[PDB]
Design a protein around this ligand. Structure first.
Ligand SMILES: *C(=S)NCCCCCCCCCCCC
Ligand SMILES: [Zn+2]
Length: 281
């Protein structure tokens, strides 16, 4: 069926305000973190030269990292953010949580900003893993290390290693060439059964199998894309009925949606308070 009265941000807002919109899933990527100063890599190269990679993308590939971990950790030093302050978009997802609307946030990002914004483990599928924890790569071992320990090793420019077994310690991130975490598949099996809206923000759905999540929702479930560009989705055909694309920066789009929902002040207050706290730390 068609649930939206209009294929626009305004039509989505009216639907969200209605009794029909009970469960929302967010699918998010690099675009929700760019205003937090988190690097994108969707469409950047000169910095990489000094490492002498076989090809730029090799720095995010598991095979190469295994053979030569030095480039990755040096790039992590050089691009490491000075602060970890979640964006308006993160805080909008916090509002969905607080208002009992957020069923789950599936994230491609590894920056921990969802957690910092106050989404709990239960609310999150960290599809591409996280920096929040790191593990020794040896199966018979798997010593866990926190971020505090991890960055100290990144800054000192010495490869992080397990003392116990001598082997490498890897941030719990999913490199290209690595299979995704179990939680991604277990959650995806049931989260999409009764979902009322997908909010797809800051991703062009370029990376598989994350991109396949959009097709798991019922045919009637509206899907809103907030992104720099259009990215399964039918926004523009004569058969379009449920997909809406709002093109721009994620913070601008979330501000616009919050304004339509009457949440603008609540959102602005939350961001202000939370940023002030982080600044004080
Ligand atoms: C897949 S889309 N995401 C996970 C890729 C893992 C590689 C991340 C590169 C991080 C290097 C920059 C570090 C900044 C702290
Ligand atoms: Zn170990």
């Amino acid at each position: 069926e068609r649930l939206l009265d209009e294929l626009t941000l305004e039509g989505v807002a009216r639907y969200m305000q209605s009794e029909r919109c009970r469960r929302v899933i967010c699918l998010v990527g690099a675009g929700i973190s760019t205003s937090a100063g988190i690097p994108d890599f969707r469409s950047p190269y000169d910095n990489l030269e000094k490492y002498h990679l076989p090809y730029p993308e090799a720095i995010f590939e598991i095979s190469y990292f295994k053979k030569h971990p030095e480039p990755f950790f040096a790039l992590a030093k050089e691009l490491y953010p000075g602060q970890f302050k979640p964006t308006i978009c993160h805080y909008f997802m916090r509002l969905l949580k607080d208002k009992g609307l957020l069923l789950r946030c599936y994230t491609q990002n590894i920056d921990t900003l969802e957690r910092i914004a106050g989404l709990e483990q239960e609310d999150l599928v960290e599809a591409h893993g996280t920096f929040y924890t790191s593990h020794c790569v040896s199966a018979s071992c798997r010593h866990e290390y926190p971020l505090s320990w991890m960055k100290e090793k990144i800054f000192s420019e010495v490869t992080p290693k397990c003392e116990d077994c001598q082997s490498l310690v890897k941030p719990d991130i999913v490199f290209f060439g690595e299979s995704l975490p179990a939680r991604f598949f277990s959650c995806m099996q049931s989260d999409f059964l009764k979902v009322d809206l997908l909010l797809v923000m800051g991703t062009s759905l370029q990376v598989q199998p994350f991109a396949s999540l959009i097709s798991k929702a019922p045919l009637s479930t509206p899907r809103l894309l907030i992104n720099k560009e259009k990215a399964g989705m039918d926004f523009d055909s004569k058969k379009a009925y449920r997909d809406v694309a709002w093109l721009g920066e994620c913070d601008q789009g979330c501000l616009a949606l919050a304004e339509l929902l009457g949440w603008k002040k609540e959102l602005e207050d939350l961001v202000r308070r939370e940023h002030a706290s982080i600044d004080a730390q």
